[PDB]
């Protein structure tokens, strides 16, 4: 009784796992089990071997138990009821089948018995009947339903659910040689057999198994289950920990669960609080700098060390400022730390730039760290979020795996996500909105009135726009109307930190202050949080430069030559205009 | 065999309904000839003819090609061209190393669907243009300023000495507007304001004078259309503002149209129905009148929508185009920069209607899609009343920013349901995001919202939006609650009401079905039971 390196692999990797009913389910064979109560035992009991099933004439158990009969549907009603299909099953295989389905695998039952009797095991697993592959007896109908009785099957039943939905890696788990079949009969079959000899071992195909169990907590705890380490620790990173924190206590709470109670999160180390802050938030549960009077759960753990926090993490959670995030994953790939299997997603809005061409977080952990990374991108102003008021976001997926994955790690009750595909459209919304709330904050020092604001909206997101598809034309229209696109762009340009400090800044510039700076009033302002849309905006334009499109957006372009003082705080509103104009002296 | 003074009626209407105008250079557009590699065309401006310049731009403004037809040599005449707009492909003229004319026009009208083109010139090519082809011009007119030719000018259908005599026979428009509210009125003030300067040339556009039908009211009407004509303000609807001094008011609706070639609609939409009925019935609008809608809100027909512009169609019998976008009335009535669509029943009145609107504070973007620019700017004030009852709860930016979201996203299906030829761009113009935004954080559906839920909340439930419309709004009207009230029976009607859980979720708790509470949990409270 023991795996083997590539089958394991195939066991915690897997899309479906199909189970046989009769002896790997069911501690009881059901033609039998139907034979007492209907007192035919040993009529049955020579028919349900080799010598009879080993070759037969033409028939096996399952057809020829049925030809015995003179037997009637308020029967099969009766037999129902006397075996209860709930004290028929093995222990551990509800505990086993609850696991699966919470982590997204889907279950299959798969008989060469009689569907009436897999059904109400399926019922009673939550398995649907379009997840049972198995066939009826032969009933004579009428013109309602029912008066009286009238080779490579589960191979085939493979085969037709791997045409029908995107699963890639199926098991068979069984007992008798029908289970071995869904393997070995065709190339499109199983990808692996476990055999089950918890009710009958049977020898002879057990030998020819991928893997041989005894007890269904022998499959139970091989079952992945995911650490996970968030890499940040400033506003959003903590409120996004707390979320993530309940959901692994809650998945912890059943037998077997998808994640570790505990969640580990990396604390960069600051001058001015050394070891105290970290040593404060593991006594406290609280990040008092950057998230104070908000409970981090008590699963949440607290470390300064970068390599310590992420080596034993199956997922890795990126929320960091993104001007660290380039030197951040240069660590972690000089160290060797993150193995190629691990998940990856990022909460991260900045780019680098890169060949003169932007590289947004997701494609930077891809490229360095050699793993896919996914992204969440939603209108999250993240104080709000902390004290539970409603809110949703978009997870884009790097591939529809792990989107189930960082759904049920992510959503709340107080926290809607939204799964799509489109992961350089939710991550670059998430990313240029920042300059655009920049400049709507500018409009705000100003003094300009709804819509005036309204049109510096309108221009940016049609840049937004623009610019996603001068760089990735994949991206779909779709995506600018999810949580990731217009929501975010409104929230942000409405309430958050971009906002705030560049309506400061503007009104302090036409007040006459022509010294005061970004980085001045980030200090002043925002408590030891980052500032993102000025970073933004340059990196931005640094690519508009190189490519010659800084007339191609003429929003983005004159946001930078007010920043930096070219162009007047006063003309935003005319950046047609403002973009070309000649300097200001 | 004199000159023809006065033409001749089917030449009037045939110069107004004139696809292209050929001038010829010499002696008509320029005061000299030629005479005199190197290149030196010293001027070129030095060269042009009195109001001929005012003649091309004006033909222009009307969607009329101009064209230059030249005896003479090309590299002379390219200048002229290029400082009168003309391209060089509209420039037929030979260069330096006989039916010319004719030939030319036959070449017009195998390359371009003209029909009606017109000669100007002073000589004897120009009249053989008309003459010279059973494919050429249409008419002749004879230019007498720089050079009187006798023999051209008994013959032609036009004869005239100063370019103002045709200038003063293009189409003029006269221009009323319907209705008299806030945004009205200082729409308004922005087409008086372009009629005022249009008029400032001799073949405007427009007529200066811009007439304004001012609806009477029981409280206050004897007076206030001499107040209006007197003050140049709207004291009740637009108190402060200076409308310009070519606005006229009349309480009279037949009249105010009787005379108009451009009608612009923009009344509160509930009585829309009811004008245009009117209109009808008077039989004082033309087939040929031109109509631009300005008014958000639909009327229910058939349990299908009908928006404006359909209204005014199917009941008037004309095209109706539409303004659309965040267009909060006080703030541009003060000039502060702001954005609109035009969406336009065909590009011809689309050119003429922003031409009207657009001002140096207001800039106008045109767009062929009117079913989506218009359903846009109705559906918004939905959006906008949920808004401010989320304002009025307290909410956060995230959560607003969700109500925005999920109102942009039941907009957009709501559009394609019943208009598949709605695209996806017009909803990043101005008439869609735009205007959502602007009402939802600036606009009076969201303050009455709000109010309303600020006192729901805290206890209130005998308010209603009718009280408030009435404390709140100075005789203004809400279109919100209307409009989602229009949109649940055509929801109720073809069983969409879970399609468009906020939508419904809003009327809902305008009603009293649904706790102000949970506007946030639209998914769930559009479809749980009442109280
Ligand atoms: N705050 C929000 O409401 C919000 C919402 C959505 C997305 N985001 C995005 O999340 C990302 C991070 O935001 P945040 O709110 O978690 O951070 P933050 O703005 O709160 O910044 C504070 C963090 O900066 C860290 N820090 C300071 N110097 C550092 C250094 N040299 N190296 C590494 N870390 C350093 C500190 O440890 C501190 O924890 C950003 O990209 C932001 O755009 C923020
Ligand atoms: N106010 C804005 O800022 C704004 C901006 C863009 C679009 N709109 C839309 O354009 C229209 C704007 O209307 P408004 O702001 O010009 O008007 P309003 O709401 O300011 O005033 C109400 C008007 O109703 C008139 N009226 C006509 N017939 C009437 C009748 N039988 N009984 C009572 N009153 C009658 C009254 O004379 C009065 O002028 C609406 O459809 C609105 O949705 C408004
Ligand atoms: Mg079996
Ligand atoms: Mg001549």
């Not at 029967?75 to 009821?81: G, P, T």
């Not at 299909?85 to 009689?114: C, D, M, Q, W, Y």
Request: aromatic share 8%; net charge negative.
């Amino acid at each position: 009784s023991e795996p083997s390196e590539q089958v394991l692999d195939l066991w915690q990797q897997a899309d479906a796992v199909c189970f046989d009913v009769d002896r790997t389910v069911t501690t009881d064979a059901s033609v039998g089990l139907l034979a007492k109560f209907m007192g035919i035992e040993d009529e049955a009991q020579s028919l349900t071997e080799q010598a009879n099933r080993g070759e037969i004439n033409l028939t096996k158990a399952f057809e020829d138990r049925l030809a015995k009969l003179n037997f009637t549907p308020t029967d099969i009603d009766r037999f129902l009821e006397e075996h209860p299909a709930h004290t028929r099953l093995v222990p551990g295989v509800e505990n086993l089948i609850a696991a699966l389905k919470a982590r997204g695998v889907e279950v299959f039952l798969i008989s060469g018995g009689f569907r009436e009797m897999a059904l109400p095991i399926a019922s009673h697993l939550k398995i649907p009947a379009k997840n049972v592959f198995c066939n009826t007896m032969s009933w004579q109908l009428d013109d309602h339903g029912e008066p009286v009785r009238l080779s490579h099957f589960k191979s085939r039943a493979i085969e037709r659910i791997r045409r029908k939905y995107p699963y890639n890696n199926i098991i068979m788990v069984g007992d008798g040689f029908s289970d071995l079949e869904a393997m070995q009969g065709s190339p499109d079959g199983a990808d692996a057999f476990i055999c089950f000899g918890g009710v009958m071992q049977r020898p002879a195909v057990a030998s020819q198994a991928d893997w041989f169990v005894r007890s269904y907590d022998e499959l139970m705890a091989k079952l992945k289950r995911y650490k996970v380490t968030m890499v940040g620790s400033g506003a959003w990173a903590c409120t996004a920990v707390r979320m993530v924190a309940q959901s692994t206590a809650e998945a912890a709470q059943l037998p077997g669960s998808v994640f570790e109670k505990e969640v580990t999160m990396w604390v960069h180390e600051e001058k001015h609080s050394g070891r105290n802050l970290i040593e404060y938030i593991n006594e406290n549960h609280e990040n008092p700098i950057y998230l104070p009077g908000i409970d981090l759960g008590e699963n949440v753990k607290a470390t300064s060390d970068l390599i310590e926090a992420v080596r034993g993490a199956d997922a890795l959670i990126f929320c960091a400022p993104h001007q660290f995030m380039h030197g951040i994953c240069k660590q972690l790939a000089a160290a060797r730390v993150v193995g190629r299997g691990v998940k990856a997603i990022s909460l991260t809005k900045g780019m680098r730039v890169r060949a003169e061409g932007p590289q947004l977080i997701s494609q930077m952990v891809s490229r360095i760290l050699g793993i896919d990374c996914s992204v969440l991108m939603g209108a999250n102003i993240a104080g709000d979020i902390a004290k539970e008021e409603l809110s949703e976001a978009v997870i884009a997926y790097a591939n529809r795996e792990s989107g189930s994955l960082w759904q049920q790690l992510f959503q709340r009750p107080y926290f809607a996500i939204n799964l799509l595909a489109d992961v350089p459209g939710a991550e670059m919304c998430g990313t240029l909105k920042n300059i655009v709330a920049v400049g709507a904050g500018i409009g705000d020092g100003l003094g300009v009135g709804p819509n005036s604001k309204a049109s510096i909206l309108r221009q940016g997101l049609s840049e937004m726009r623009k610019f996603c598809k001068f760089i990735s034309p994949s991206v779909r229209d779709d995506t600018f109307f999810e949580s990731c696109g217009v929501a975010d762009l409104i929230a942000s340009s409405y309430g958050g930190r971009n906002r705030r400090v560049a309506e400061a800044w503007a009104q302090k510039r036409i007040a006459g202050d022509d010294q005061v700076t970004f980085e001045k009033l980030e200090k002043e302002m925002l408590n030891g949080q980052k500032l993102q849309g000025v970073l933004t905006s340059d990196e931005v334009q640094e690519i508009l430069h190189a490519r010659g499109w800084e007339l191609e957006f003429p929003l983005f372009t004159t946001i930078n030559r007010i920043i930096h003082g070219e162009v007047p705080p006063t003309m935003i509103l005319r950046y047609r205009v403002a973009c070309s104009m000649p300097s200001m002296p």
